[PDB]
Amino acid sequence: MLIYKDIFTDDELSSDSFPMKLVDDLVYEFKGKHVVRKEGEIVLAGSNPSAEEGAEDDGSDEHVERGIDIVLNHKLVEMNCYEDASMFKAYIKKFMKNVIDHMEKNNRDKADVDAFKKKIQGWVVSLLAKDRFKNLAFFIGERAAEGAENGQVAIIEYRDVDGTEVPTLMLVKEAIIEEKCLE
């Protein structure tokens, strides 16, 4: 059992026995599973095939909170850098300013911050390159997306390991605080 909190979306971000990793001492690999919340009958293939938008003004779906378990946990709103290029760029500027400044309070010395800065800046420039990274689905906490806050984007990907689609959340260490709960 682990309780997850962000700098901005700290309040209700996440809280369950989720498998999590720290890669490169930079990013948390937070694994989930593709599921649907359907208030009547949980069927994963029993969801609205959203061709264009699925923006049906009177009932977008049939109470099918379709997505991955990571997103459906706290109800994170989807965004795609294809159309959301400007909005997502705003959150990226918020992100890099937040994470480096967070570390500038932790370190200040230019030993760890400037090192971290090369890693995270280099990481995101590679990570946002849709040529191969087009398997990313960008999400943001309902709280941060309501007030246009300085909260970061939850970077989701679907991955194909041993014939299984595994959706893994990517978040930076420097805006996330893992709170272990083992009595």
Q: Which domains does the chain have, with CATH numbers?
A: 1-183 (2.170.150.10)
- Count of Cβ atoms closer than 10 Å to residue 154 Cβ: 26
> Which tokens sit at 107?
């370190």
Asked if 101 and 113 touch (Cβ cutoff 8 Å), the reply is no
Distances (CA, A) of 105 to 1, 85, 101, 115: 29, 30, 6, 15
Distance of CA 172 to the CA centre of its chain: 10
Q: How far apart are CA 172 and CA 26, in angstroms?
A: 6
Q: Does residue 67 sit in helix, strand or coil?
A: strand
Q: What is the DSSP string of 12-52?
A: TSEEE---EEEETTTEEEEE--EEEEETT---TTSS---SS
Distances (CA, A) of 48 to 36, 37, 59, 63, 160: 11, 12, 11, 10, 23
> Which tokens sit at 13?
């971000």
Asked if 175 and 4 touch (Cβ cutoff 8 Å), the reply is no
Q: How far apart are CA 138 and CA 60, in angstroms?
A: 20
Kind plus residue range of the DSSP H or E element containing 180 = strand 176-180
> Which tokens sit at 51?
């061709």
Q: Phi and psi of 25, rounded to 5°?
A: 50, 40
